[PDB]
Amino acid sequence: ITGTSTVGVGRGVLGDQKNINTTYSTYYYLQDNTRGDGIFTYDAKYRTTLPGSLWADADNQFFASYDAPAVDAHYYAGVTYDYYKNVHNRLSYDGNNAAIRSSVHYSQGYNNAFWNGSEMVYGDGDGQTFIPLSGGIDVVAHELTHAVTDYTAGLIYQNESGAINEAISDIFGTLVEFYANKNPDWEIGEDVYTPGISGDSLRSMSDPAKYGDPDHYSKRYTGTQDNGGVHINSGIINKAAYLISQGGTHYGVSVVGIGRDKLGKIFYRALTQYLTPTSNFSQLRAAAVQSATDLYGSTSQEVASVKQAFDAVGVK
Numbered sequence: 001i002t003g004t005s006t007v008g009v010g011r012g013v014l015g016d017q018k019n020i021n022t023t024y025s026t027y028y029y030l031q032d033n034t035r036g037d038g039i040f041t042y043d044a045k046y047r048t049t050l051p052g053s054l055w056a057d058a059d060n061q062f063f064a065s066y067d068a069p070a071v072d073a074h075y076y077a078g079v080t081y082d083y084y085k086n087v088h089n090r091l092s093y094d095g096n097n098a099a100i101r102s103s104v105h106y107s108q109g110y111n112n113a114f115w116n117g118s119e120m121v122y123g124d125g126d127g128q129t130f131i132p133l134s135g136g137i138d139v140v141a142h143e144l145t146h147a148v149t150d151y152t153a154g155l156i157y158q159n160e161s162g163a164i165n166e167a168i169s170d171i172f173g174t175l176v177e178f179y180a181n182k183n184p185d186w187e188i189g190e191d192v193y194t195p196g197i198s199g200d201s202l203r204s205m206s207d208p209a210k211y212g213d214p215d216h217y218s219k220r221y222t223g224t225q226d227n228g229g230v231h232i233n234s235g236i237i238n239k240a241a242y243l244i245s246q247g248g249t250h251y252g253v254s255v256v257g258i259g260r261d262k263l264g265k266i267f268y269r270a271l272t273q274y275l276t277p278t279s280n281f282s283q284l285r286a287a288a289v290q291s292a293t294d295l296y297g298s299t300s301q302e303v304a305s306v307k308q309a310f311d312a313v314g315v316k
């Protein structure tokens, strides 16, 4: 759309008011011209045909219930863009300011969200297992981060490399949640999962076993479902990343924490310089150690915490 940049206001999934960047040309579109080559939000209208219609509104106010998921997908994709630019110096997912596109209201009662190879897609949930998925900042950033991986290491979505792929998505979604300081935690999806139950989440980084995911390499899933457990074995990496950041004793192995910012810097450098499509857990270990070496010196505390962390979850 070609028009005039403006600012509208709306209410998100959780009922929070926010301002969003729109474009005015007869109608007000969910098109933010302020970030790279733009952030574009589409209405999939309960269908599975993508992307749908660029979101159009007559008055620049987005308070209707149907507007909610579009408001949050558009706003949270701006926050994620900003985290990447400001913290890591990366312009959009490809590093060259590629336009960011998201479609909301995909299908009916759809309990998931995904990156399709070219855009983000968000279901509305069935109302009991999930509310509309874009209402979770860690969900949004998990999604955008799959594009980032796809453009960098290119981790294949199966087995070890696939669980590394999921872990990256969960680690950076959690980092963007602390960046925005939106009630941050080390849990995944808590703001949109099981609206009737408090205190739970989809996955836990601090304690993956809380929901039955492995927290040690010896407990890895070796089967076939879930593309070889990409959403299951990511718990072993998630726990390692939580130990590097926060510290603790796990299975008798003690880790001194080095904090979230260093965790983000070592993981991004491993992702952009050292990992390949077929990297496995032991290679991720070498890549994180090398990153931390590059950045802080071989004899630093940083490098020592990365080794301890991996030794705690049984990786090498």
Ligand SMILES: CC(C)C[C@H](NC(=O)[C@H](CC(C)C)OP(=O)(O)CNC(=O)OCc1ccccc1)C(=O)O
Pocket (backbone or CB within 6 Å): 111, 112, 113, 114, 115, 116, 117, 133, 138, 139, 142, 143, 146, 157, 188, 189, 202, 226, 231
């Ligand atoms: C019950 C689900 C939420 C758990 C799970 N999905 C997830 O953990 C998150 C959403 C969470 C963060 C809200 O979704 P993912 O981004 O990992 C689902 N992605 C996914 O399956 O991607 C594969 C793909 C490749 C090309 C084209 C289409 C799709 C799963 O698909 O198993």
Ligand SMILES: [Ca+2]
Pocket (backbone or CB within 6 Å): 057, 058, 059, 060, 061, 062, 063
């Ligand atoms: Ca309106």
Ligand SMILES: [Ca+2]
Pocket (backbone or CB within 6 Å): 177, 182, 183, 184, 185, 190, 191
């Ligand atoms: Ca939270």
Ligand SMILES: [Ca+2]
Pocket (backbone or CB within 6 Å): 138, 174, 177, 184, 185, 186, 187, 188, 189, 190
């Ligand atoms: Ca969270």
Ligand SMILES: [Ca+2]
Pocket (backbone or CB within 6 Å): 190, 193, 194, 195, 196, 197, 198, 199, 200, 201
């Ligand atoms: Ca819940």
Ligand SMILES: [Zn+2]
Pocket (backbone or CB within 6 Å): 142, 146, 166, 169
């Ligand atoms: Zn994922």
